[PDB]
Design a protein around this ligand. Sequence first.
Ligand SMILES: [Br-]
Ligand SMILES: [Br-]
Ligand SMILES: [Br-]
Ligand SMILES: [Br-]
Ligand SMILES: [Br-]
Ligand SMILES: [Br-]
Ligand SMILES: [Br-]
Ligand SMILES: [Br-]
Ligand SMILES: [Br-]
Ligand SMILES: [Br-]
Ligand SMILES: [Br-]
Ligand SMILES: [Br-]
Ligand SMILES: [Br-]
Ligand SMILES: [Br-]
Ligand SMILES: [Br-]
Ligand SMILES: [Br-]
Ligand SMILES: [Br-]
Ligand SMILES: [Br-]
Ligand SMILES: [Br-]
Ligand SMILES: [Br-]
Ligand SMILES: [Br-]
Ligand SMILES: [Br-]
Ligand SMILES: [Br-]
Ligand SMILES: [Br-]
Ligand SMILES: [Br-]
Ligand SMILES: [Br-]
Ligand SMILES: [Br-]
Ligand SMILES: [Br-]
Ligand SMILES: [Br-]
Ligand SMILES: [Br-]
Ligand SMILES: [Br-]
Ligand SMILES: [Br-]
Ligand SMILES: [Br-]
Ligand SMILES: [Br-]
Ligand SMILES: [Br-]
Ligand SMILES: [Br-]
Ligand SMILES: [Br-]
Ligand SMILES: [Br-]
Ligand SMILES: [Br-]
Ligand SMILES: [Br-]
Ligand SMILES: [Br-]
Ligand SMILES: [Br-]
Ligand SMILES: [Br-]
Ligand SMILES: [Br-]
Ligand SMILES: [Br-]
Ligand SMILES: [Br-]
Ligand SMILES: [Br-]
Ligand SMILES: [Br-]
Ligand SMILES: [Br-]
Ligand SMILES: [Br-]
Ligand SMILES: [Br-]
Ligand SMILES: [Br-]
Ligand SMILES: [Br-]
Ligand SMILES: [Br-]
Ligand SMILES: [Br-]
Ligand SMILES: [Br-]
Ligand SMILES: [Br-]
Ligand SMILES: [Br-]
Ligand SMILES: [Br-]
Ligand SMILES: [Br-]
Ligand SMILES: [Br-]
Ligand SMILES: [Br-]
Ligand SMILES: [Br-]
Ligand SMILES: [Br-]
Ligand SMILES: [Br-]
Ligand SMILES: [Br-]
Ligand SMILES: [Br-]
Ligand SMILES: [Br-]
Ligand SMILES: [Br-]
Ligand SMILES: [Br-]
Ligand SMILES: [Br-]
Ligand SMILES: [Br-]
Ligand SMILES: [Br-]
Ligand SMILES: [Br-]
Ligand SMILES: [Br-]
Ligand SMILES: [Mg+2]
Ligand SMILES: [Mg+2]
Ligand SMILES: [Mg+2]
Lengths: 146, 148, 158, 143, 151, 144, 149, 146
Amino acid sequence: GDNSNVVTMIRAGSYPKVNPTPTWVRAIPFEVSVQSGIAFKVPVGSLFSANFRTDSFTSVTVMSVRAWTQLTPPVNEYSFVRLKPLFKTGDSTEEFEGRASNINTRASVGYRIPTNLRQNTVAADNVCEVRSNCRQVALVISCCFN
Amino acid sequence: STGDNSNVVTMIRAGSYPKVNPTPTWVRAIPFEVSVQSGIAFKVPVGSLFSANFRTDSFTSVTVMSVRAWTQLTPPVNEYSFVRLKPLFKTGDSTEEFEGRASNINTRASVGYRIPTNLRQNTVAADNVCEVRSNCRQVALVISCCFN
Amino acid sequence: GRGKVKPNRKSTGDNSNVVTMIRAGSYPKVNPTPTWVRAIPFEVSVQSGIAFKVPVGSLFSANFRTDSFTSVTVMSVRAWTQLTPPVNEYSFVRLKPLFKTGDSTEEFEGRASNINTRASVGYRIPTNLRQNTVAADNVCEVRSNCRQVALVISCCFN
Amino acid sequence: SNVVTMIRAGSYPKVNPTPTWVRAIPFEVSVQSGIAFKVPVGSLFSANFRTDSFTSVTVMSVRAWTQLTPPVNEYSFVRLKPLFKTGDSTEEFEGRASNINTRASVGYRIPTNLRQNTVAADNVCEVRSNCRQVALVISCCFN
Amino acid sequence: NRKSTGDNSNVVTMIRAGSYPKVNPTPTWVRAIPFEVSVQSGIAFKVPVGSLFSANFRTDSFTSVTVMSVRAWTQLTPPVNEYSFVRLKPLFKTGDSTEEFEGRASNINTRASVGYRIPTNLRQNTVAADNVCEVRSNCRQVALVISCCFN
Amino acid sequence: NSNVVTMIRAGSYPKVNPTPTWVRAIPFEVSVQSGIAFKVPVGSLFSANFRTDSFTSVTVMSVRAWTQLTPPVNEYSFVRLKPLFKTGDSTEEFEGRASNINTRASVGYRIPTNLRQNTVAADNVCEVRSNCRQVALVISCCFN
Amino acid sequence: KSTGDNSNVVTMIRAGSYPKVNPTPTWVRAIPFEVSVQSGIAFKVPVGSLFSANFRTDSFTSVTVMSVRAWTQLTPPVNEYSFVRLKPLFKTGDSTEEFEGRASNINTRASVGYRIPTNLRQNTVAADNVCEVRSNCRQVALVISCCFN
Amino acid sequence: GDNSNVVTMIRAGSYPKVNPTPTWVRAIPFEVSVQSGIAFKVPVGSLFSANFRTDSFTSVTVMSVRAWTQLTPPVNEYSFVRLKPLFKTGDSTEEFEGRASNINTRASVGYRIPTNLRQNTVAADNVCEVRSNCRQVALVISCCFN
Ligand SMILES: [Br-]
Ligand SMILES: [Br-]
Ligand SMILES: [Br-]
Ligand SMILES: [Br-]
Ligand SMILES: [Br-]
Ligand SMILES: [Br-]
Ligand SMILES: [Br-]
Ligand SMILES: [Br-]
Ligand SMILES: [Br-]
Ligand SMILES: [Br-]
Ligand SMILES: [Br-]
Ligand SMILES: [Br-]
Ligand SMILES: [Br-]
Ligand SMILES: [Br-]
Ligand SMILES: [Br-]
Ligand SMILES: [Br-]
Ligand SMILES: [Br-]
Ligand SMILES: [Br-]
Ligand SMILES: [Br-]
Ligand SMILES: [Br-]
Ligand SMILES: [Br-]
Ligand SMILES: [Br-]
Ligand SMILES: [Br-]
Ligand SMILES: [Br-]
Ligand SMILES: [Br-]
Ligand SMILES: [Br-]
Ligand SMILES: [Br-]
Ligand SMILES: [Br-]
Ligand SMILES: [Br-]
Ligand SMILES: [Br-]
Ligand SMILES: [Br-]
Ligand SMILES: [Br-]
Ligand SMILES: [Br-]
Ligand SMILES: [Br-]
Ligand SMILES: [Br-]
Ligand SMILES: [Br-]
Ligand SMILES: [Br-]
Ligand SMILES: [Br-]
Ligand SMILES: [Br-]
Ligand SMILES: [Br-]
Ligand SMILES: [Br-]
Ligand SMILES: [Br-]
Ligand SMILES: [Br-]
Ligand SMILES: [Br-]
Ligand SMILES: [Br-]
Ligand SMILES: [Br-]
Ligand SMILES: [Br-]
Ligand SMILES: [Br-]
Ligand SMILES: [Br-]
Ligand SMILES: [Br-]
Ligand SMILES: [Br-]
Ligand SMILES: [Br-]
Ligand SMILES: [Br-]
Ligand SMILES: [Br-]
Ligand SMILES: [Br-]
Ligand SMILES: [Br-]
Ligand SMILES: [Br-]
Ligand SMILES: [Br-]
Ligand SMILES: [Br-]
Ligand SMILES: [Br-]
Ligand SMILES: [Br-]
Ligand SMILES: [Br-]
Ligand SMILES: [Br-]
Ligand SMILES: [Br-]
Ligand SMILES: [Br-]
Ligand SMILES: [Br-]
Ligand SMILES: [Br-]
Ligand SMILES: [Br-]
Ligand SMILES: [Br-]
Ligand SMILES: [Br-]
Ligand SMILES: [Br-]
Ligand SMILES: [Br-]
Ligand SMILES: [Br-]
Ligand SMILES: [Br-]
Ligand SMILES: [Br-]
Ligand SMILES: [Mg+2]
Ligand SMILES: [Mg+2]
Ligand SMILES: [Mg+2]
């Protein structure tokens, strides 16, 4: 085992349980555009794409959302980014926020979804609202594609 | 059961932007069948492992680790099922004929072969995994592999 | 009844202050051209939106003392952005492995969190994919919003 | 692991495109009967050894073997007289064979306090032998 | 070191001196000498050993020095869009080297630093007319700190 | 130990000081006449002969004295030291005598920490007395 | 048996193959010799003084000096105590140290010495100098520890 | 303490006992020419030479003698060498002998001198007699020059 130099025989038995289309836990990176003073609803459909090897999925269970400002903030200001989670059974009002302490540095923050709120979404659903003084925010969403 | 968390969304104290990879690898084992004729060896093409039916249509290369085969249909009359595998390599084919036979005419014949580490390079669709032989008109394969 | 051969001022272990005699025996196995494990630093030019294939021929050069070699087994690749990024942006750098037996579709990426700082990333090659390459071969594709990328490749010249 | 992996690289490290490299250089020299031959350090800088990029080298120890057969009725012998730029030696480290068909061999170590750089124009040692060729193996540090 | 916990004498005390000792009015001195050198683009600058002998370092009484290690820092800002870098090539009277110890800054606003240690077998004296090393950089000045033994 | 140069992974520019302090033992001689005390000037400690011409101030810790020349005929050597200070001169006469006429006389005195302040070339360290015409001093001090 | 090792007659040595030899080996020595010194003038001790048949070292051409010790060889001036100074000399750069030793008895020698560090122990030839010697005495006795090669 | 890089001061004391011409223990290698069947008398004067750095000596105390055949033997023969110790108070009749088991290989033999016979010998003296079917013999004599 891990020590041979040639092919060896496998004494296979019965035909096992199979599944050609299994689930997949992923940390999907992508960016969204953000206007000043306006909240942007992140579509779940942005997680289904051939750029991520996920165009074969139609449902996803989101587990946590992390955000980073992707461009520089306005003059004289430090970057900030806010996140309001959204849920189909009822949206929240939390505004998890992070700010940069160095004007040249990104702002970041995230939120975890409790187990009791980890159901499936589809491309028409929205994950959360994003607010920032920077015109583009980079998101890394950890989720289970099924 | 105690070992849980909370019932509400919590805040994550994220740090710097991490290293990312939108197109990662995937250790998989693909199930698919191949048609085989009597007295004729069928070369299993690697392209069979790339398909939307397997969520692998974004990959172009794969590293095969082990191959297993079952007879998918019944054997001829009066006969028991058998299946054979001959590993094929771009750097040099083999001449091993890993064979399994059933001891019950109603039962599948099965066999497999592991690939050693020193022979675990990438293969593309134009390549072949192995030759298959059998007295049955179809063989079912399950190929453990690493897509990249 | 052995005794006395020659006096070479050998004091303690380390060290001695004069030349000493070595009791050489049979001629040993030798190799005038041995292998050499190295970490080669070099830069490449990159256009925005276009991938650049890093030629393995850049590793063989008199600037690295690697000019007698014709092959090289690459182990890992590391990349840093060598110039500043576009205005309002943070630096990023991507790497896609390339192999003669089959190119990969990974895009290992690293970004800067400070606009004044390099973006960095790398990837290790598994032992089962560590064969030799020649100058006509390519190591990996590189992408970046910066016009230059600094590469440091860990390899075994042979 | 059978597949590539991502390295979480940090800041650009300290690099050196032209390191030093420690070696054991093998090469032969031609020796005349009764005459001493000064081994040049330039024999160590050659593409035949991959060391052509260097111009200096610190020699650590010298080892010699007769490369051809000795004269009729004789046994092989080889001598070594170290040579330094600050002051040549008068030692004659000699080795003799006990079988006429076997090589003669000898070597000498250079002490730490005499391990400075040498250039191609300098000389390592003098070789004396009754055989027309001697095989040298010099352990040194190219820099 | 005496008592260390007992230094209480508030007045002069007598010293029972014996025989005249060995003396040396001009001893050695281990130092880390900081000084800068001007560098041009695409050109190596040979650092002269004479810069180590100066009244600005209390060392103008010396004429020889044994260098132990060299450390360099970029002293001015680098060109536009570039990260600072500096290279050192050791020089020796018995034979110049070809090593180019290089350090690069990862933040354009930060210095680039690198250094190299000399081994014991290469620690001999150097005089003003000698050179320490070659310095290469994209910045017009390089701050050096040379650890040495003035003797 | 290694036989070739090695790389140092330097970091941020350190704190530096091109003109540091120096703890020293300075040996010099003074001329002394019979029946009269010689005031040792602190300026004698600042000289290129000692590698201390760059200094203008020094903190003295202890003073040791030896007779440098032979004594008068029939006499044993003796040397005396009376400390001096800018805040208050002392009246101690630390004295040592030779028990062999062919041997030096020696003596010294330590300065307490509470009296270890700087002095300049103007100041004087101590008064020296001896029946010999020259005295050899070895003053331990801190240059700054 | 029979008096363990105390053999009273010749015995046979079962020699083997020929060993590595050297008719001209190195010799670590403490070489004593005197030098002539003037008043207020430094004398450069030549390395050639170490090569001589008086020391059995005339067959050597180089030598690695390890340390230098000096003693005044004659009496000092009237009223004075003996003293001797040593300033090391090196081919790569001369030292400015003046290691000094004085006598505390006028009838006794003054003495001092200095050690050379390993990194400065290279070979010297007859044209080289070891150090400068200063003294109020007119002759100084030296004992130089060195390795002949 | 140990790793000094600069010259350090030695606190020398009284002038020590000195000796410009000390003794020297040595292993002197030299060859002698021999005839067939004839015993050759090895002279002690062959140990005093500038080629051995010992021309300043005039006496030497020999401790042990070892001999190797320096040239090849006659055809059909294995090399041999004999040693007979010679002493100023009475020569010996011992013939310590060694023969080669390979015609291409040297023969060798030696003898140790007992402490009670280790007196000085001058140039005119003789160490031993040598007998060999080879025309040269290589001697290595461990002695104490004084
Ligand atoms: Br095997
Ligand atoms: Br098998
Ligand atoms: Br199963
Ligand atoms: Br998974
Ligand atoms: Br992932
Ligand atoms: Br896909
Ligand atoms: Br805004
Ligand atoms: Br809760
Ligand atoms: Br990370
Ligand atoms: Br990954
Ligand atoms: Br996986
Ligand atoms: Br699977
Ligand atoms: Br068929
Ligand atoms: Br049937
Ligand atoms: Br078959
Ligand atoms: Br069939
Ligand atoms: Br030897
Ligand atoms: Br030694
Ligand atoms: Br070997
Ligand atoms: Br090798
Ligand atoms: Br290596
Ligand atoms: Br390297
Ligand atoms: Br390139
Ligand atoms: Br492997
Ligand atoms: Br771009
Ligand atoms: Br990592
Ligand atoms: Br790294
Ligand atoms: Br790193
Ligand atoms: Br580093
Ligand atoms: Br390096
Ligand atoms: Br090396
Ligand atoms: Br080598
Ligand atoms: Br010869
Ligand atoms: Br080369
Ligand atoms: Br010779
Ligand atoms: Br020469
Ligand atoms: Br010859
Ligand atoms: Br001192
Ligand atoms: Br110091
Ligand atoms: Br300092
Ligand atoms: Br310029
Ligand atoms: Br000064
Ligand atoms: Br000064
Ligand atoms: Br080394
Ligand atoms: Br370091
Ligand atoms: Br600091
Ligand atoms: Br300081
Ligand atoms: Br100090
Ligand atoms: Br005065
Ligand atoms: Br008085
Ligand atoms: Br004054
Ligand atoms: Br000064
Ligand atoms: Br105080
Ligand atoms: Br008086
Ligand atoms: Br007996
Ligand atoms: Br016997
Ligand atoms: Br010796
Ligand atoms: Br002289
Ligand atoms: Br004087
Ligand atoms: Br003078
Ligand atoms: Br002589
Ligand atoms: Br005299
Ligand atoms: Br007396
Ligand atoms: Br008297
Ligand atoms: Br050393
Ligand atoms: Br005088
Ligand atoms: Br030191
Ligand atoms: Br003696
Ligand atoms: Br003859
Ligand atoms: Br004959
Ligand atoms: Br006979
Ligand atoms: Br006798
Ligand atoms: Br006895
Ligand atoms: Br006789
Ligand atoms: Br015969
Ligand atoms: Mg930002
Ligand atoms: Mg005297
Ligand atoms: Mg023979």
